Amino acid sequence: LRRVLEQLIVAHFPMQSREFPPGTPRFNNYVDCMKKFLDALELSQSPMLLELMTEVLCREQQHVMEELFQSSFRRIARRGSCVTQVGLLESVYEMFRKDDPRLSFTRQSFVDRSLLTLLWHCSLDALREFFSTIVVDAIDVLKSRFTKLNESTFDTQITKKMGYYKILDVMYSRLPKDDVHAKESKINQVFHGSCITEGNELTKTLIKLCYDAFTENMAGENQLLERRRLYHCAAYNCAISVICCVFNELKFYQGFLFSEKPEKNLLIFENLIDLKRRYNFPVEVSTLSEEMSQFDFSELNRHECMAPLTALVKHMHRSLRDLPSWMKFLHGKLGNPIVPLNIRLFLAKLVINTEEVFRPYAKHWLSPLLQLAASENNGGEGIHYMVVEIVATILSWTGLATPTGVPKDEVLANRLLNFLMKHVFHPKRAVFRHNLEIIKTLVECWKDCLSIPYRLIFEKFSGKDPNSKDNSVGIQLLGIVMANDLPPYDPQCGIQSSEYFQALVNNMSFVRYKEVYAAAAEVLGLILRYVMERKNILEESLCELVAKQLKQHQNTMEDKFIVCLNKVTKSFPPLADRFMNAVFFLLPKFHGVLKTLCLEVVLCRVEGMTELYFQLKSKDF
Amino acid sequence: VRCSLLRLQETLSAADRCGAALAGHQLIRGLGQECVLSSSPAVLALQTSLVFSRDFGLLVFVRKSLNSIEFRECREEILKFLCIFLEKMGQKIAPYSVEIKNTCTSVYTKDRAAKCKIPALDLLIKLLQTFRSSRLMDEFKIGELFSKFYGELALKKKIPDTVLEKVYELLGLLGEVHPSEMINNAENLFRAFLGELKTQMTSAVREPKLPVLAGCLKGLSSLLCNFTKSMEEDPQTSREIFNFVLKAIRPQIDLKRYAVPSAGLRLFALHASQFSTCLLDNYVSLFEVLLKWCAHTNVELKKAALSALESFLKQVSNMVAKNAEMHKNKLQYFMEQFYGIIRNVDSNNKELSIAIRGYGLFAGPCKVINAKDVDFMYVELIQRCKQMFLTQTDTGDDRVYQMPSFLQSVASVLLYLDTVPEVYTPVLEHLVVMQIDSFPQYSPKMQLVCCRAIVKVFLALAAKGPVLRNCISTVVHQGLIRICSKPVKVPTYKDYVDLFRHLLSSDQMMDSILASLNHLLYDEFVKSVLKIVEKLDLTLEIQTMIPTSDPAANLHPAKPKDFSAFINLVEFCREILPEKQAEFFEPWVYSFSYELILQSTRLPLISGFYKLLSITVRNAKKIKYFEGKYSCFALFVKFGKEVAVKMKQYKDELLASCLTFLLSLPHNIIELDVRAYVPALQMAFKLGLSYTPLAEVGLNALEEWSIYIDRHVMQPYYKDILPCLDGYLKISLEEIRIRVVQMLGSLGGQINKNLLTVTSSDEMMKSYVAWDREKRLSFAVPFREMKPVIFLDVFLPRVTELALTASDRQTKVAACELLHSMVMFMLGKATQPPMYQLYKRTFPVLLRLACDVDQVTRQLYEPLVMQLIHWFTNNKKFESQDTVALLEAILDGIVDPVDSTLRDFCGRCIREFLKWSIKQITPQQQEKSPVNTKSLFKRLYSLALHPNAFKRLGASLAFNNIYREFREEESLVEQFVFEALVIYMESLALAHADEKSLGTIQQCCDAIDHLCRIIE
DNA sequence: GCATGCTCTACTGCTTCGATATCG
DNA sequence: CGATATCG
DNA sequence: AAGCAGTAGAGCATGC
Structure with missing residues (x-):
C-alpha cells in the first residue's frame, strides 16, 4: 500500500512548492487531491500515512495549504487511543532519527513544523511514553563531539543536536515540577534501577551542559556559524524552559543563565544576537440533513529569539533597588556606548513591552534610552517606530523622571528636538499631522530647556517665490510653539525681531495657496493677542505692518482680504476700526458665504460704535 | 441665487483679457466642485433652473465673449464641464437644446486654439450620441446640421x-441618427472615408496618422448602420473594408496606444451577418490573432475581442449549418483544435471557456460526423466541468458566473444526441440544483441569463423520453428543500419569487430567444409542495401551574429546526400560486384540500395550514368550482x-388565521346556516381597531353577503352585524372608513337604522352611574394657606379604562402607578365609611391589569394583589363584607368566557387563598367563620353540579390547582374527599355531550387522577 | 466573478519660431 | 522682386 | 524644431 501510494504521489504531483499558477485547474486538481488525502488522514491514526504526508510536507520551503496541515496536526493531536498517538509520534521521530543522504533543510523542518504541534497541542499530561523512551535515546547523541573535518557530516551533527534541543524544549514546555523531581521514569529511566537520592540529579547536569552550550565561543571558529547561532539560542531556550519547568524556587539567575565572565573570552549576548547584519530596518514600519444526505448518496518579533525572551522576563515579572542578574547587568550592557548597535536595539524591544515592572524603576533606564534615541546610532532617519515607542513610553510616565536633572540629557533632548523638527515633512499628510502631534507632545512635556531654534524656523518659512508651500512647515511649527507659551524674543540669541516679523508679514503677503496664509493670519493674530496681552513690547509696529499689508490687500484683493481680516479679527478684536467703514461699504455684492463671513466680522465691535442703526438700515439689515 | 454667477458677470465686463477668461475657466471649474456631488433632486433641480436661464447664463456669456480671440479658456472649460452636466441630467433637455445647438455651432465656427477646441465638440458628440432620432429633429432639423x-x-x-478626427466621427453619427432621406449625398460618403484611408495607408511614405483612421472607420460603420451593405450589391468595398479590418487587427506590439484594434473589432461586432464569402479564406489567422487578443492585457479591448470572436463564431456556425457540405476540413480543424483546447495541458482560465461555447455551438452541425464523436463529447465535457466546482468546504474560487455558457453548451449538444450514457445524470442533477441555489449572489443581466439557461436545460431534459423525465421532478423537489431551509450576503427567500414567477408560467419571454412546459413545472411544483409537508413531524411537546388552552406553554417542538422550515414554505406558496390559476389549479383542489384537511385534523393548532387552505379557496373563488366533485362540497x-x-x-x-379562513368561502352556494358564520363576523370587527386586515376582510365579505344572499334570513340578522361597526366612525383606516360609509349608505335606507338604536344600556350606562351614591375620599391638596378638599372619586371610571387600553405607553404606566397609589390611599x-359598593367595581379590573401582557406592570400589582390578600385574610379584620366581595370577585373571575390567562391567574390566586387561610387562624373562635375552607368547598360544590358549561370547569381547574395542597393537611383530607370524587364524577358524566373541544373532560380526568392516588 | 478607482509617465500633439523651394 | 506653398 | 500640454496607459488596488 505504501509503495503504490508513493508511486502515484510521484506520478501525479509537482515537486516544488507551487511550480504553477495559483488558480489554474491543475492547481485546483492538486489542492483537490491534497484535500482528499487530509480527508483520509483526519480520523485514522495511521503511522504509515502520517509519514506519507510529512514527506510531501517538506518538499520545498513553503507551500500554500500550510495552515490545513497545522489544523490536521491539531486534529490528530487528540483523537483518543493514546497508545496509537505515541505510535505516530515515535514513528515520525524515528524517521527523523536515522541517517540517509538528504538536504538538511528537511532535517530541520521535520523537527520544526511536524511534531512540535503534536507535542504542543494536547496529547496528554500522562503521555510520558516518549519521556520514557527518549532519555537514553537522545542524551547519548547530546554528548557527542564535532567532526570538524568534513562539513557534510558536521552540519548534520549540528542539525541532529538542534532537533534534540527543540524536542527537549517542547517536552519541558508543559510538565509539572513533581514528575521531574520525584522518582519517576526520567531519573529512573536514565538510571538502571531505583535510587535513593531525591531525583534532582540529571536536571542539574542537563542545565550545566546546555549552559556550556551558548557559551562556547567562536573565537577560533570562522567556518560555519549561522547554524551555530541557532544552536546557541535554542540551547538558551532549553535552559529557560527547564528553569521554568522547575518552579525556579531560588534567586538563581545571578549565577546561572546570565553574567558571562569574558576574561576567558566568554560571551552570551553577542553569541545569540547576529552582530554582523545590523537591523537594516525600514524606518517607519432535523430531517432535512437526512433528506439531503440521501440525495448525497447519489520585524524583530519574527527573529527566532524574541518570543521566549519576552516570555522569560514576563515570568520574572509575573512571579517574582538594583538587581545584578538583569537590571544592573543589562544596564551596564546597554548604558555603555561601546557595545554595538544590535544588542541595545534588541534590548529596547523587551523593556518596551515589559515596562510595567519597570514602572517604579524607570529612572535608571531612561537616561541611556535618550542617549541611544537622540544621537545617530539607529539608521535611516532615526528608527521611527522605535523612536516613537521610546519617547511615548517615556512621556507615558510623565510626572516621574523628567529629562532635566542631567545636563547631557537636557542637551540630548535639545538636539533630538532639533532633529525631529528638521526632518519632519513626509508628503503623505496623515503621518505628517501625526509628526506635528508628536512635536506638540514633546514641547508640552519639555518645559525647561527651550532651545527653540531660530534661523531654523526662519529658514523654514523665509522661502520666497509664492508658487510652492515650503513655508507651511514654518507656520504650523509656529502654531505649535505659540499654541501654549514661549513668546518669540528673537534678538537675544537668534536674529533681530524686526525682519523676523517682517518676514512673517511677507509670508502673509504670499497670496498663492490657501492654508499657508490662512494659518499665517491665524497664528499671526494669536501673536497679536499675546503682544497685546503684554503691551510692554512695541506691538504697534507689527500692528501697522499687518495693517499696511491689509491696505495693500483691500485695493484689488477683496476675497482674500475679507477672509484674512476675518481670521485676524476672530483672533483679535480691536483692529477693526481701520476697515470698519470698508466692510460697511462693500457689505453687498459679496453674495455667497463671504457675506456670512463679513457679518461675522461686523459682529466684533459693537460696545462703543455709535449710530450703527442708520448704517445697517441703509445697508439692508 | 447667482452668487458666483454675479461674481463672473462682474469680472467679465473689465479689461485685461485672458484674465476674465481665467476667471471664467476657474469659475466654471469651481461650479465643477459644486454641481454634481450631492445625491439630491431638490437642490440639484434648483441648480438646473438656476443655470438654464437665457437672459443671463453661459450661453449669453459667450455672446459677450465669442468675439474675443484669446478667450480660449471659456471655449474649453465651459463646454467641458457643461458636457458633464449634460451627461448627468436625464431627458429633460429636449426643449432646452436649440440654444445649445446655436451656441455650439457658433463656438465651433469661432474657436481659436486646438488645445482648447475639443470640448465644444465633446458637447456636440455627447448630445448627438445621448439623443437619437426623435421629434427633436422636428424641433431643430439635424438634416440642416448635416448639410451644415x-x-x-x-x-x-x-x-x-483632432477636429479632423471629430468631423468624420460627427459625420458618421449624422449618418447614424435617422438617415432616412439621405440618398445621393450618402452615395459617395463611403468613398469619402475610403479616400482618407487610401491617403493614409496606400503608401509607405508619409507615416499614417493614427486616430483619424479609427474615426473614419467608425463613421463608415455608423453609416453602414441602417444602410447595411449586404454582400449582394457590391462585392468590392466589402472586400476592401475587410482588408481594412485586417489592417486594423495586426499585432502591433512595441507601443501602448491601441485604438484602431478596438475600432476594427467594434466594426466587426455588428455587421457580421451581411458578410457572405469574405469570411472564409484567412479564417485561421483571424482565429489566431483573435485568440491572442483575448489575452491582450487590457480593460475593454478584452471585451471587444470576446464579443467579436463569439459573434463571428456564431455567424460562421449558422453559416456552416447551411454550409454542411464544403467546410468538412474547416470544421475538422475546429474539432481537433477544440479537442486540444478541451484537454488540460495547462489551460488556465479562459482559453477553454472561449471554445466550450463554440464547441457546443458546433455540436449542432455535428450531426453527420461520426455518431460517436458526439458521444466522446458530453462525457469529455461533463468530466471537464465536474472537476472545477463542488470543491472542499469554505474557500471560494466561484467561477459559476460563466457556468451559464457551459450549461448552454451542455444543452446544445444534448438536444441532438440519442441514447444517453446516463451514468452522469446524478452529476447533472447535482449541477442544476447547485445553480438554482446560487441565484441571489448574481447581478441583473446575469440572473436572467441564468434563468434562460435553466429553462433551456429543462427544455432539453423533458422531450427525450419518459424513462428519463424523473430527474426533472427530483431536482425541483430537492431544490425546494434547498430554498426552504435557510435561516429566516445571506438571503432569506426573497430572490427566487421573481425566479419562479418568470419561470413557471410567465416564462413566455424565454421561449423566444432559445430556439406544455408550464404544465409540467406546475404539476411538479404542487407535487413537491404536498410532499414536503408529510416528512416534517412538527409535534410540539411539553416543557416545564395548570395551563388550560390549546397553544399554551407546551411549546418546545420535537424538531425546532422544522418550524422555520415550514413557515418559509407557506408564504412561498402564497406568493407563487395565484400566478395564472386560469387553467392549472382547477383539478388539483380536491386532492390538495383533502390532504391538507387530513393533516389539519390530527394537528389543528398550527397556523399557516389555514393560510394554504385560504389560498386554495381563494382560487376556488377565482375559478368557479361551486354549484351544489360533490364530495369536496360536502367536505368543506x-x-x-x-x-x-x-x-x-x-x-x-x-x-387571525382561522378567521381569515372562515370568512372566505364561495358562499353564493353555501347559502344555508348563516347563523354558524356570524359569530365570526361579529369578531372580525371587534378584534379590529388595533389591526387592519381582519377588519378589512370582514367588510370585504359583508360586501358579498348582502348582494348575493337572498335577503330573507339576512333580514333578522342585522341587529348583530351592524351595531358593532359604530366603533369605527370616530390601504389604511381612512380608505377603509370611506369604504365603510359607502357600504353603510348604499346598504339601503330602512336597514341601517338598526345601527344606532339597538341597546344604549349594557355597560355604557353602568359607567354612567356613580360607583357610590354618596361621595367619599376627601383629599385635601396641601398648600401653605388653604388646604382645600377635592373628592378623589369622580375621575375614576376614566383612569380605570385608560389604564386598561391606551396604545400610549408613555403614560399607561403612569396611570397604573397613580392607580397603585390610589388603591394604597x-x-x-x-x-380607621364603608366602600363595599366600591370594591365590587374596583377589583375585577384590578386583576386584569395585574396580569395582562407586559412585564413591568406585572412586576407591579402582583405583590400588591398578594399583600392585599394577606391583609384581607386575617383576624383583626375578620369576616367583614370586603372579604366576601374579594372572594366573590375571585370566583366569578374564575368562571368567565375567553380570558384564559386571567383564568389561570385566578387559579393561582385561589391556591394562595387556600394556603394563607389555613395559615393564619386559631380554632378557638373560628366556629362561625364564613372564611372557612368548608364554605369554599361548598361554593365549589355548587359550582360543580351545574349545567353552565364553564361553571364546573372552574371547579375542576381549581382542584387541579389545589391538589398540591392537602397532601400535608389532616382532619380534612379524609372525609369528604370521596364525596368530592362522587361530585366530580357526576359532573363528568353530565358533561357527556358538551364537546371534546371544550376540554372539561381532559381536566376532570386529571382531577380524578389526583383523587385516586391520594385515596390509595 | 464583472464593474470601478488612484498612478504618475511616456508618447503624441499644439503652438511657435525659423528656414526654404517655386513660377514670372 | 511678388507672391505661394511647404517644411522643420 | 522645441518646450510644454494633454490623456491613454497598463499596474495595482477596492469593493460588492
Whole structure:
C-alpha cells in the first residue's frame, strides 16, 4: 500500500512548492487531491500515512495549504487511543532519527513544523511514553563531539543536536515540577534501577551542559556559524524552559543563565544576537440533513529569539533597588556606548513591552534610552517606530523622571528636538499631522530647556517665490510653539525681531495657496493677542505692518482680504476700526458665504460704535 | 441665487483679457466642485433652473465673449464641464437644446486654439450620441446640421489632427441618427472615408496618422448602420473594408496606444451577418490573432475581442449549418483544435471557456460526423466541468458566473444526441440544483441569463423520453428543500419569487430567444409542495401551574429546526400560486384540500395550514368550482362548521388565521346556516381597531353577503352585524372608513337604522352611574394657606379604562402607578365609611391589569394583589363584607368566557387563598367563620353540579390547582374527599355531550387522577 | 466573478519660431 | 522682386 | 524644431 501510494504521489504531483499558477485547474486538481488525502488522514491514526504526508510536507520551503496541515496536526493531536498517538509520534521521530543522504533543510523542518504541534497541542499530561523512551535515546547523541573535518557530516551533527534541543524544549514546555523531581521514569529511566537520592540529579547536569552550550565561543571558529547561532539560542531556550519547568524556587539567575565572565573570552549576548547584519530596518514600519444526505448518496518579533525572551522576563515579572542578574547587568550592557548597535536595539524591544515592572524603576533606564534615541546610532532617519515607542513610553510616565536633572540629557533632548523638527515633512499628510502631534507632545512635556531654534524656523518659512508651500512647515511649527507659551524674543540669541516679523508679514503677503496664509493670519493674530496681552513690547509696529499689508490687500484683493481680516479679527478684536467703514461699504455684492463671513466680522465691535442703526438700515439689515 | 454667477458677470465686463477668461475657466471649474456631488433632486433641480436661464447664463456669456480671440479658456472649460452636466441630467433637455445647438455651432465656427477646441465638440458628440432620432429633429432639423457640417467638411481642408478626427466621427453619427432621406449625398460618403484611408495607408511614405483612421472607420460603420451593405450589391468595398479590418487587427506590439484594434473589432461586432464569402479564406489567422487578443492585457479591448470572436463564431456556425457540405476540413480543424483546447495541458482560465461555447455551438452541425464523436463529447465535457466546482468546504474560487455558457453548451449538444450514457445524470442533477441555489449572489443581466439557461436545460431534459423525465421532478423537489431551509450576503427567500414567477408560467419571454412546459413545472411544483409537508413531524411537546388552552406553554417542538422550515414554505406558496390559476389549479383542489384537511385534523393548532387552505379557496373563488366533485362540497361544508366551533379558545394569530379562513368561502352556494358564520363576523370587527386586515376582510365579505344572499334570513340578522361597526366612525383606516360609509349608505335606507338604536344600556350606562351614591375620599391638596378638599372619586371610571387600553405607553404606566397609589390611599382612609359598593367595581379590573401582557406592570400589582390578600385574610379584620366581595370577585373571575390567562391567574390566586387561610387562624373562635375552607368547598360544590358549561370547569381547574395542597393537611383530607370524587364524577358524566373541544373532560380526568392516588 | 478607482509617465500633439523651394 | 506653398 | 500640454496607459488596488 505504501509503495503504490508513493508511486502515484510521484506520478501525479509537482515537486516544488507551487511550480504553477495559483488558480489554474491543475492547481485546483492538486489542492483537490491534497484535500482528499487530509480527508483520509483526519480520523485514522495511521503511522504509515502520517509519514506519507510529512514527506510531501517538506518538499520545498513553503507551500500554500500550510495552515490545513497545522489544523490536521491539531486534529490528530487528540483523537483518543493514546497508545496509537505515541505510535505516530515515535514513528515520525524515528524517521527523523536515522541517517540517509538528504538536504538538511528537511532535517530541520521535520523537527520544526511536524511534531512540535503534536507535542504542543494536547496529547496528554500522562503521555510520558516518549519521556520514557527518549532519555537514553537522545542524551547519548547530546554528548557527542564535532567532526570538524568534513562539513557534510558536521552540519548534520549540528542539525541532529538542534532537533534534540527543540524536542527537549517542547517536552519541558508543559510538565509539572513533581514528575521531574520525584522518582519517576526520567531519573529512573536514565538510571538502571531505583535510587535513593531525591531525583534532582540529571536536571542539574542537563542545565550545566546546555549552559556550556551558548557559551562556547567562536573565537577560533570562522567556518560555519549561522547554524551555530541557532544552536546557541535554542540551547538558551532549553535552559529557560527547564528553569521554568522547575518552579525556579531560588534567586538563581545571578549565577546561572546570565553574567558571562569574558576574561576567558566568554560571551552570551553577542553569541545569540547576529552582530554582523545590523537591523537594516525600514524606518517607519432535523430531517432535512437526512433528506439531503440521501440525495448525497447519489520585524524583530519574527527573529527566532524574541518570543521566549519576552516570555522569560514576563515570568520574572509575573512571579517574582538594583538587581545584578538583569537590571544592573543589562544596564551596564546597554548604558555603555561601546557595545554595538544590535544588542541595545534588541534590548529596547523587551523593556518596551515589559515596562510595567519597570514602572517604579524607570529612572535608571531612561537616561541611556535618550542617549541611544537622540544621537545617530539607529539608521535611516532615526528608527521611527522605535523612536516613537521610546519617547511615548517615556512621556507615558510623565510626572516621574523628567529629562532635566542631567545636563547631557537636557542637551540630548535639545538636539533630538532639533532633529525631529528638521526632518519632519513626509508628503503623505496623515503621518505628517501625526509628526506635528508628536512635536506638540514633546514641547508640552519639555518645559525647561527651550532651545527653540531660530534661523531654523526662519529658514523654514523665509522661502520666497509664492508658487510652492515650503513655508507651511514654518507656520504650523509656529502654531505649535505659540499654541501654549514661549513668546518669540528673537534678538537675544537668534536674529533681530524686526525682519523676523517682517518676514512673517511677507509670508502673509504670499497670496498663492490657501492654508499657508490662512494659518499665517491665524497664528499671526494669536501673536497679536499675546503682544497685546503684554503691551510692554512695541506691538504697534507689527500692528501697522499687518495693517499696511491689509491696505495693500483691500485695493484689488477683496476675497482674500475679507477672509484674512476675518481670521485676524476672530483672533483679535480691536483692529477693526481701520476697515470698519470698508466692510460697511462693500457689505453687498459679496453674495455667497463671504457675506456670512463679513457679518461675522461686523459682529466684533459693537460696545462703543455709535449710530450703527442708520448704517445697517441703509445697508439692508 | 447667482452668487458666483454675479461674481463672473462682474469680472467679465473689465479689461485685461485672458484674465476674465481665467476667471471664467476657474469659475466654471469651481461650479465643477459644486454641481454634481450631492445625491439630491431638490437642490440639484434648483441648480438646473438656476443655470438654464437665457437672459443671463453661459450661453449669453459667450455672446459677450465669442468675439474675443484669446478667450480660449471659456471655449474649453465651459463646454467641458457643461458636457458633464449634460451627461448627468436625464431627458429633460429636449426643449432646452436649440440654444445649445446655436451656441455650439457658433463656438465651433469661432474657436481659436486646438488645445482648447475639443470640448465644444465633446458637447456636440455627447448630445448627438445621448439623443437619437426623435421629434427633436422636428424641433431643430439635424438634416440642416448635416448639410451644415457637410459644408464644413467639403469646403474644409488642413484641419490638423483632432477636429479632423471629430468631423468624420460627427459625420458618421449624422449618418447614424435617422438617415432616412439621405440618398445621393450618402452615395459617395463611403468613398469619402475610403479616400482618407487610401491617403493614409496606400503608401509607405508619409507615416499614417493614427486616430483619424479609427474615426473614419467608425463613421463608415455608423453609416453602414441602417444602410447595411449586404454582400449582394457590391462585392468590392466589402472586400476592401475587410482588408481594412485586417489592417486594423495586426499585432502591433512595441507601443501602448491601441485604438484602431478596438475600432476594427467594434466594426466587426455588428455587421457580421451581411458578410457572405469574405469570411472564409484567412479564417485561421483571424482565429489566431483573435485568440491572442483575448489575452491582450487590457480593460475593454478584452471585451471587444470576446464579443467579436463569439459573434463571428456564431455567424460562421449558422453559416456552416447551411454550409454542411464544403467546410468538412474547416470544421475538422475546429474539432481537433477544440479537442486540444478541451484537454488540460495547462489551460488556465479562459482559453477553454472561449471554445466550450463554440464547441457546443458546433455540436449542432455535428450531426453527420461520426455518431460517436458526439458521444466522446458530453462525457469529455461533463468530466471537464465536474472537476472545477463542488470543491472542499469554505474557500471560494466561484467561477459559476460563466457556468451559464457551459450549461448552454451542455444543452446544445444534448438536444441532438440519442441514447444517453446516463451514468452522469446524478452529476447533472447535482449541477442544476447547485445553480438554482446560487441565484441571489448574481447581478441583473446575469440572473436572467441564468434563468434562460435553466429553462433551456429543462427544455432539453423533458422531450427525450419518459424513462428519463424523473430527474426533472427530483431536482425541483430537492431544490425546494434547498430554498426552504435557510435561516429566516445571506438571503432569506426573497430572490427566487421573481425566479419562479418568470419561470413557471410567465416564462413566455424565454421561449423566444432559445430556439406544455408550464404544465409540467406546475404539476411538479404542487407535487413537491404536498410532499414536503408529510416528512416534517412538527409535534410540539411539553416543557416545564395548570395551563388550560390549546397553544399554551407546551411549546418546545420535537424538531425546532422544522418550524422555520415550514413557515418559509407557506408564504412561498402564497406568493407563487395565484400566478395564472386560469387553467392549472382547477383539478388539483380536491386532492390538495383533502390532504391538507387530513393533516389539519390530527394537528389543528398550527397556523399557516389555514393560510394554504385560504389560498386554495381563494382560487376556488377565482375559478368557479361551486354549484351544489360533490364530495369536496360536502367536505368543506363539514370542515367549516367543525372549525367554527373549534376556534373558541385561542388568543392571537391562530385566531387571525382561522378567521381569515372562515370568512372566505364561495358562499353564493353555501347559502344555508348563516347563523354558524356570524359569530365570526361579529369578531372580525371587534378584534379590529388595533389591526387592519381582519377588519378589512370582514367588510370585504359583508360586501358579498348582502348582494348575493337572498335577503330573507339576512333580514333578522342585522341587529348583530351592524351595531358593532359604530366603533369605527370616530390601504389604511381612512380608505377603509370611506369604504365603510359607502357600504353603510348604499346598504339601503330602512336597514341601517338598526345601527344606532339597538341597546344604549349594557355597560355604557353602568359607567354612567356613580360607583357610590354618596361621595367619599376627601383629599385635601396641601398648600401653605388653604388646604382645600377635592373628592378623589369622580375621575375614576376614566383612569380605570385608560389604564386598561391606551396604545400610549408613555403614560399607561403612569396611570397604573397613580392607580397603585390610589388603591394604597383608599386603604389609607378605610383603616380607621364603608366602600363595599366600591370594591365590587374596583377589583375585577384590578386583576386584569395585574396580569395582562407586559412585564413591568406585572412586576407591579402582583405583590400588591398578594399583600392585599394577606391583609384581607386575617383576624383583626375578620369576616367583614370586603372579604366576601374579594372572594366573590375571585370566583366569578374564575368562571368567565375567553380570558384564559386571567383564568389561570385566578387559579393561582385561589391556591394562595387556600394556603394563607389555613395559615393564619386559631380554632378557638373560628366556629362561625364564613372564611372557612368548608364554605369554599361548598361554593365549589355548587359550582360543580351545574349545567353552565364553564361553571364546573372552574371547579375542576381549581382542584387541579389545589391538589398540591392537602397532601400535608389532616382532619380534612379524609372525609369528604370521596364525596368530592362522587361530585366530580357526576359532573363528568353530565358533561357527556358538551364537546371534546371544550376540554372539561381532559381536566376532570386529571382531577380524578389526583383523587385516586391520594385515596390509595 | 464583472464593474470601478488612484498612478504618475511616456508618447503624441499644439503652438511657435525659423528656414526654404517655386513660377514670372 | 511678388507672391505661394511647404517644411522643420 | 522645441518646450510644454494633454490623456491613454497598463499596474495595482477596492469593493460588492
